[PDB]
Amino acid sequence: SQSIIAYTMSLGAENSVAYSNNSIAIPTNFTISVTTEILPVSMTKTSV
Amino acid sequence: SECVLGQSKRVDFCGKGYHLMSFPQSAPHGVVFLHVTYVPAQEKNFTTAPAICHDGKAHFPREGVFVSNGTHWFVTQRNFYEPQIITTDNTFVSGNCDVVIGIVNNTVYDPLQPELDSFKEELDKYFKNHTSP
Amino acid sequence: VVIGIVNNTVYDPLQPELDSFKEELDKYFKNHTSP
Amino acid sequence: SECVLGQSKRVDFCGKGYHLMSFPQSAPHGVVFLHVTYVPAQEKNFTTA
Amino acid sequence: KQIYKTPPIKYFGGFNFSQILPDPSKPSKRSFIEDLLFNKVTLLICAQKFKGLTVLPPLLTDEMIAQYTSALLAGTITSGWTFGAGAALQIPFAMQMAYRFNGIGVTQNVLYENQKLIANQFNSAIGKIQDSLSSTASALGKLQDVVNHNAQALNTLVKQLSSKFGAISSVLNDI
């Protein structure tokens, strides 16, 4: 059943690109996305 | 200051991809940005050629790139497929087609060419009709 | 298909650029074919 | 992010002079950038209006 | 997020990238410049630091870092710049150079009319780069300083316990 395992990390897929000296690629459609981002701006004040 | 009050250009600074805008929101002791960005979808590939020689003279795209689907060449933008006919108002000339490498052969169809032809045919028909009187 | 488009005339400067010679040429053709 | 994945307009940020591209290399506890920059050669003076 | 790989062909419009791409002859898939960087920087005191001081290994190993670097290099010379903003396209190098020139402020023809000269100039520059690193010894100070500072800090901390701190004796048991 369930057990703890250890292994070697995976860096992702390969996706080789077939470069050629007369080959071009142009998209025919697009998409619009929204990405969130968080930033701290001020820690709480204090006094002693 | 940069992402909100204007459109930024530093890649991967105001959201992954090409940047359209951003919206701010507050949070307890912090801020949260919503980056609205643009990303190209599925793509098609074609055969390209850096230059074009028509009357023994090279031609370069005004703003675009030369692509071809096998039989007819076209000039398009760099981020969305939308071909147009090769026109002088899309190309500028430089030198002669002997030094650049990879150039190909085609015809360059000026649009002012049929614009003036619209009266060249008028003159031709006028003179053909006028031959007898 | 575009929304909010309005009606007006688009004046290509090539139109007056040709016309300044073309109407004169038309007058010359009137003086040309008639006699 | 800027000088590698794109061409930067920030003067004197991705190499002394106009910037074309860059190449990264690794090093023990560090990185090394090779900025390929462009610099005008000898010139000539003319009269302008 | 994609580990791109270099193509078997190596004719990049006359440019010569042989000095930066990974070398298969070495057991480690480094490159010549990276080899010189690794040789120049010199890192049983480590065994004598057993007195409660450890040096944990980094999560990423050198081969993994080299694989990242290879992926970036294979992306930036075949896909141009678009692989950092979504789907990765493919553009011939001899015209991506033209696009970069167009970005600078000069038009396109200036490149194609001097393609071979520019290729020769770039090859000479990249060849001459290696001698600058190989000759002098002050080039890599900005990384030697870090390891020197860490070694100095560790040595000072270790040697500190020999001080008696105004007590009877530094050794604990004799007290």
Ligand SMILES: *[C@@H]1O[C@H](CO)[C@@H](O[C@@H]2O[C@H](CO)[C@@H](O[C@@H]3O[C@H](CO)[C@@H](O)[C@H](O)[C@@H]3O)[C@H](O)[C@H]2NC(C)=O)[C@H](O)[C@H]1NC(C)=O
């Ligand atoms: C590559 O793209 C070109 C440009 O579209 C294709 O050539 C053009 O193909 C269209 C049809 O797909 C032809 O339209 C023709 O219209 C007449 C009516 O005027 C009709 O009778 C014909 O049956 C045909 O539909 C057009 O003539 C033709 N050429 C041009 C200059 O536009 C070409 O087929 C594409 N090739 C591939 C492999 O995708």
Ligand SMILES: *[C@@H]1O[C@H](CO)[C@@H](O[C@@H]2O[C@H](CO)[C@@H](O[C@@H]3O[C@H](CO)[C@@H](O)[C@H](O)[C@@H]3O)[C@H](O)[C@H]2NC(C)=O)[C@H](O)[C@H]1NC(C)=O
């Ligand atoms: C693009 O088109 C031009 C012309 O439309 C092509 O140039 C032509 O090339 C052929 C063969 O290279 C020439 O034919 C032979 O030329 C020799 C002189 O080298 C002559 O002695 C022979 O009798 C025969 O004519 C042809 O003359 C030449 N055209 C002109 C006007 O000189 C060019 O090769 C084409 N390139 C591509 C990539 O399609």
Ligand SMILES: *[C@@H]1O[C@H](CO)[C@@H](O[C@@H]2O[C@H](CO)[C@@H](O)[C@H](O)[C@H]2NC(C)=O)[C@H](O)[C@H]1NC(C)=O
């Ligand atoms: C256009 O791109 C597609 C893939 O997006 C190409 O199709 C495959 O490309 C891979 C790339 O290495 C090849 O290994 C496959 O053999 C290709 N399969 C087929 C059926 O072609 C396609 O070849 C590209 N277009 C052209 C004209 O090469």
Ligand SMILES: *[C@@H]1O[C@H](CO)[C@@H](O[C@@H]2O[C@H](CO)[C@@H](O)[C@H](O)[C@H]2NC(C)=O)[C@H](O)[C@H]1NC(C)=O
């Ligand atoms: C570009 O992609 C969009 C979606 O990413 C396509 O819009 C979809 O079209 C299909 C078929 O017409 C519809 O069933 C979907 O509902 C559409 N999506 C949405 C969100 O409404 C669009 O057709 C694509 N453009 C082209 C030219 O193929």
Ligand SMILES: *[C@@H]1O[C@H](CO)[C@@H](O[C@@H]2O[C@H](CO)[C@@H](O)[C@H](O)[C@H]2NC(C)=O)[C@H](O)[C@H]1NC(C)=O
């Ligand atoms: C812009 O002008 C066109 C040209 O007249 C208008 O199209 C006419 O619309 C009316 C009402 O729908 C029709 O009865 C005519 O037959 C149309 N004529 C033509 C030539 O299309 C159009 O409605 C105008 N639109 C605006 C917003 O002013």
Ligand SMILES: *[C@@H]1O[C@H](CO)[C@@H](O[C@@H]2O[C@H](CO)[C@@H](O)[C@H](O)[C@H]2NC(C)=O)[C@H](O)[C@H]1NC(C)=O
């Ligand atoms: C790319 O550059 C490398 C090194 O600058 C070239 O390798 C050397 O090429 C010269 C040719 O004159 C030989 O004499 C050397 O023996 C080569 N050295 C090694 C280590 O290979 C390589 O030939 C160049 N290749 C291309 C296609 O330009």
Ligand SMILES: *[C@@H]1O[C@H](CO)[C@@H](O)[C@H](O)[C@H]1NC(C)=O
């Ligand atoms: C691409 O490179 C190969 C290898 O030299 C060459 O045979 C081919 O002609 C090149 N393509 C173009 C369009 O020059």
